Amino acid sequence: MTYTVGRYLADRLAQIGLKHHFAVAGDYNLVLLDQLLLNTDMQQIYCSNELNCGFSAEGYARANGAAAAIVTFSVGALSAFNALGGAYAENLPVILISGAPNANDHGTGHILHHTLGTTDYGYQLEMARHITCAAESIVAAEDAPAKIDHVIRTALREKKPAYLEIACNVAGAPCVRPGGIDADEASLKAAVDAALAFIEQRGSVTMLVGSRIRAAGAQAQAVALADALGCAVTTMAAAKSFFPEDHPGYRGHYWGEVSSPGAQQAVEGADGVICLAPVFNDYATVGWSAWPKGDNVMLVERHAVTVGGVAYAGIDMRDFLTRLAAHTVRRDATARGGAYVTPQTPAAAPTAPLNNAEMARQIGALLTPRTTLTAETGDSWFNAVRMKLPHGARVELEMQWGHIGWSVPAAFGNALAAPERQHVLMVGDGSFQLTAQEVAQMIRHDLPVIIFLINNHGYTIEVMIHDGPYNNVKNWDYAGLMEVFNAGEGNGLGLRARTGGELAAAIEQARANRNGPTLIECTLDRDDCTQELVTWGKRVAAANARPPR
Amino acid sequence: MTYTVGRYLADRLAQIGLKHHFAVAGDYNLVLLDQLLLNTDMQQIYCSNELNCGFSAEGYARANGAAAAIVTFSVGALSAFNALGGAYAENLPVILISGAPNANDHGTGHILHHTLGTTDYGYQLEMARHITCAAESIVAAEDAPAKIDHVIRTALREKKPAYLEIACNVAGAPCVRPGGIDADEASLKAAVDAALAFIEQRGSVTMLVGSRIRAAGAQAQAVALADALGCAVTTMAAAKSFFPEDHPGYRGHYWGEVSSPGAQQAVEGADGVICLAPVFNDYATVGWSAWPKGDNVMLVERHAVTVGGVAYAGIDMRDFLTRLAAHTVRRDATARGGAYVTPQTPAAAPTAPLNNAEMARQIGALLTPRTTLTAETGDSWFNAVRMKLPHGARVELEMQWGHIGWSVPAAFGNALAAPERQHVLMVGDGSFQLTAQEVAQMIRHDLPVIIFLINNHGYTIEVMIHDGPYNNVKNWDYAGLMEVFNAGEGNGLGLRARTGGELAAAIEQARANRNGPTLIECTLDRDDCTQELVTWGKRVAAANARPP
Amino acid sequence: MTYTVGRYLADRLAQIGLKHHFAVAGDYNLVLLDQLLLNTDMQQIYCSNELNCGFSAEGYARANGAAAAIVTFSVGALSAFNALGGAYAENLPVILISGAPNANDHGTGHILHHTLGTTDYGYQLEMARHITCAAESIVAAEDAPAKIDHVIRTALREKKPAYLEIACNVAGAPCVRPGGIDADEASLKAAVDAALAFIEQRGSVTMLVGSRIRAAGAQAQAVALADALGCAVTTMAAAKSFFPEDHPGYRGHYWGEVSSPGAQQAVEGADGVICLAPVFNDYATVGWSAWPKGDNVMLVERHAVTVGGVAYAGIDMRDFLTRLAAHTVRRDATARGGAYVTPQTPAAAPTAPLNNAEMARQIGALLTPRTTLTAETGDSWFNAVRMKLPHGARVELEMQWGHIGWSVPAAFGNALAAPERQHVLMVGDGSFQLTAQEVAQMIRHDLPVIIFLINNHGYTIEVMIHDGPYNNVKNWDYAGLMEVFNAGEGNGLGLRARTGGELAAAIEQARANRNGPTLIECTLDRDDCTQELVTWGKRVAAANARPPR
């Protein structure tokens, strides 16, 4: 059986540790999908639509480290681009492979199906270059190994996604086989010496862990530096779970005036803040109100540290933090005697109407060290950041891209990447409507994801930035949807919870559904949301609206 | 009270004839949506997601002439771009407007939500320029009139979509008000004389009507020319319904070896073919096998005619066709003796298992002159092109872009644009799962769309180009979905038809459902499809696979 | 004195070893040029126009390793882009820095001078992304270190050029200071083991050295492998000088039917060819006639080797060649008893009309181990590739980009990068007309470049692909131009040579001009060119013209 270009790609994807890749068929990729099916270290997973395909691969990469999605030219890839730009924003090496016109059509002027109807077939690549770290087109088998290895090696080095298109008559063409793997003292001393003087010369220091720290591979080194300093540690909201909440120095999330108790003063009252790989965007800074920077910040990024008025280039954040931790003095003033303060809401009477605080209390009680909680944009961001996490629990947030509906397909991909964990999904009713059909794929693969669907009858987070008729949604019977997707062949279970007692019974049933997803539709009033959402929403709306010049 | 940049856009959109625009809210567009709401000539319609928002605008433009969709930066617009590229492919002036960063963030290096996380806000405009005829960004109210009028005037002139983004703090900023409207004889003589010579020198001439003729506004002039020539007239598959099927010269669709009976010889056996605004792509030419071109073809395009070895530029197709029809000789040889042959499927025994031919027969019987039949990519293309159309019936096909799932939001937008017509949607089960949630918006607006969902358990069209496990889909209870979307406040109705008797009884219940959509889930075997799909699919596949 | 963004860039450019950078002033870069003037490890050099500016930096990088050019927005940068795409094509890390609009104009709709007159100021960056490996815009000083270090570190790693624009009011803004520096066994064993089996299983092997081998840093390792194998070694034309011509295995250039004697048979008659970092384009393959590839080629590239039907990724060409050389058996059949054969033209009678072969004989006799010979596109490519090189002599060719006129500004930049060497420039009269004014800069800096200007009254190389009235040029008094550029303040010398005796006397005078350039205008008939030009020109023209499908 002749070895082909598509096999070359399949074998490299398996080699970088994918166990699955995601696809939607179209004639320009069918031979490629057949070549990928020959690799039996991976399962080929089919998605309902390409936007869902792309966010399933994004969710898979959060657990696995990388992922791949394969789509057809133009009508598949342009939807997958929203999710690919999402992977770029969230520092995940997703490889999007699109099927593409037969190479013999290049140079002809032939107009081809799925294109704009002009002689141009390069617009899709051109568009992809704006949202990836590498983008290549294979029209000849002899070029395929260099292009495949370039796109995979660059994506994995940068932790950013990349794009590959393969002419449809070349996916099955003969190719060579893959071999090998796609899977500075003075500078470091100067940077470490400056960071040690920054700590030593201050009376108090607090660490603030940012949401690029996973992409830097530096989470364990952050803990070593926290152990050595004994300082208060806080996380930015989008870094929820990236630092252990049972560490004796952890004091919660820093998010300006919506911080955990004590955390705003820990960061803003300290003589120096050590910021590890942050994303200071308008939402994270609460409309530019909460943004530690400048001479009293040691800004540590994946290949540079800026401290004491100097940017030290050429140093790896991991080696830096390890050396700094081995030599620093202790600065424990912002931690001593303090603790991380989490909500302590008393249980509601079981028959009272369900409210947000009761629902969040029951969800937080479900978390284990083995839980992965995917939380959608909406008030679920604020309920998730408020949860006290058992050590080992993972929270996945998409706070820089913020595409509502990401969470459904992302929970499906994560559940396939990490089947040993307990997957829990918190998604609002508005977000659910964009990508709901990927629950039918959860059902198809008997994945036991527990989904809390928060039915507050519209886009409550927008109701709290700026209200209007556009925040209303058509209501669905969300719980009844599960039987519709099972269609007599599936173990999906849909339950409704209108009280704390109904929610607790629904949760018991969900935990007992071992071979399919359970959706629990939790009914809340439209204005029953976290206080933090309202305080943040005000500040961020005022920032968006601020008047020209 | 103070007139704003978003009211200037709203008023221009109303001025070009929109009665609706489509939107998905996000913080970058809310002020803009509040300004659009002030125009009471339009209704603002909310969509489940942005791919569906864009394709509802595309289906609305097919009936209305134009459309607009409003989305938020990046997370909204990048999915709407698939639909915008689809409006370019299908020659429809959809205007996509996206909300965008506050103008005071430009020049700062601020990182913003919904972006790539870099200091770049211009990637979205840059991407949009590849799929539109005009693309502008407003960051200052002083510029907004020239940029709104350039995108709308260019889109309407070119019959192609356009892109506008408006900084979120500028949509509510004061603006001037809109006034005025956004809504060669020697060359024509030379072209008409060469075309007259082309016809007079030939004994058998046939017309082939192409799917860019509606973008040219030349459908009535094509009828005038067919009346003068008396010749056979055929339509390309994607031009279904663009020429009237009761015309005495109509001889059905030309589609190479899957043509209506006699139509392949009408075109391929003629001494000349008059080709009106065709798209000869790989699917239309049946893998490059069926492609009339060259010295024996008069190729008539929007602004140019190529005939007799010369390309005549600067002539409007409408004026050309009217002058040619007024002077031409008659050439009726290709019509003599012939007729349009359409399927004559006998009615099945009512309790026999449903098959595709029976389902197609009953859907064909439902069509009227006031029907719009939206037909999805899949075997529904072949069942639609085979339908005998009453004069005036409209069929909508998306055969150049061909994005499965387009039909659901496109039928929703066409139902809002043309509420006086009877809307019928044929959609396959695989396609329905990409965009199904827009049926909930049909229910929200009480639109009486009758939807035939063909449940043959997978992607049968693909099963016929090249089969594999990727053609299987997770089955749904499609009928039972209607009550889920009603959620106690809607008039959607879901029915199942497993026999011709059950299908006839479901169609009569669907016709009686006047205030909400009815989905009839028709069960067919995977391999029970038209013969034309099988024949077309193998040619088309062989062309895709041809070796380096 | 406050440290600024422009200083940050100046100090990083000095740190990567530039001794000069090239500039043309415009109001959008004047404050930046003032910040660069503060670094006294570099000289700021002014160019006549931006295309010349960009090719002076390209020539400088060939000697130095890297280079920088600074230009004004749009009217400067778009000309510099031709030279930047040239640097990409020739694998040289040139950094182009453009001055750019004031940051406060972004977001205003202001129309600005030097732009297209629309509200768009991003088109220049967008265009630059197609011809560089990194492209960034600085509009805020706090972003400047990351963007500067990203563009320099990426350019130096990739050996490709990069682009940076800096808002004009930010070049002088305060900035932090620069610290630190911008300056796999199993895979390697598998690749080496396969390459050793490739050699061992064959009776004869020949090495073919390609013009990407400098960018790979692998020239010394190629010599070690040639020493170990004892095989015939040949160079592709564009690799002239990248392998030592006095090595006992060297047998000249392989260039199909225009190869050195014996070299075509060495490569095409061998059982296996080891190809080191080649560029097989239409000119190198002589119109696709001479292109060793496939199962009998070991293709060695900077990070991959393809041999024995496998592409081994993840291995550095230098480590690979060193390990291969340490273990290979000898395969000397294609070298034994052979020698590199070079032209042996007898000296012309001194008073006979000068002809090409006599001119090339005198130029070849001028070369020393310390010579850098820059040779322009035209018949000078074929005269240069025919020269026998003393060990250490460098030849610079621009055979992939092939922009006529490159050679003038490239010889000026090289002469500044490497003033310890003897610089010689061979440029035809047509090419000279595109960029002649950079000889006035050679004069301004007293650079003793000897220029042979071949005046054959038009574009003789095109006359031999396809003749027409477009191959004629307006003749100039090239030798008289030198006094015009000196304008009473310069040591440029212009001489004419119409015979071999006049050329020899002119050369003596040139060698004696120690403080300025000498141009010797050599008069040749239009059809007096190398035989190789005519044979190559035919083949490459036939390839260009070959008929649609």
Ligand SMILES: Cc1ncc(C[n+]2csc(CCOP(=O)(O)OP(=O)(O)O)c2C)c(N)n1
């Ligand atoms: C693709 C996309 N379109 C629009 C938005 C704007 N958006 C941000 S939050 C949100 C509503 C989320 O509503 P829901 O999921 O019901 O969450 P709630 O706040 O009610 O819990 C919207 C429309 C977005 N973020 N992404």
Ligand SMILES: Cc1ncc(C[n+]2csc(CCOP(=O)(O)OP(=O)(O)O)c2C)c(N)n1
């Ligand atoms: C967005 C998109 N992705 C993938 C494709 C490839 N595609 C062409 S037809 C088809 C299947 C259509 O299946 P169905 O709607 O069930 O129609 P059938 O042929 O079964 O009646 C596919 C997947 C496409 N055209 N568009």
Ligand SMILES: Cc1ncc(C[n+]2csc(CCOP(=O)(O)OP(=O)(O)O)c2C)c(N)n1
């Ligand atoms: C910028 C640019 N424009 C046009 C060309 C096409 N070109 C290739 S060689 C050449 C003529 C070179 O003439 P000359 O320098 O007189 O060299 P000769 O062959 O006569 O020695 C031309 C015009 C090119 N290579 N670069």
Ligand SMILES: [Mg+2]
């Ligand atoms: Mg909600």
Ligand SMILES: [Mg+2]
């Ligand atoms: Mg189907």
Ligand SMILES: [Mg+2]
């Ligand atoms: Mg010349």
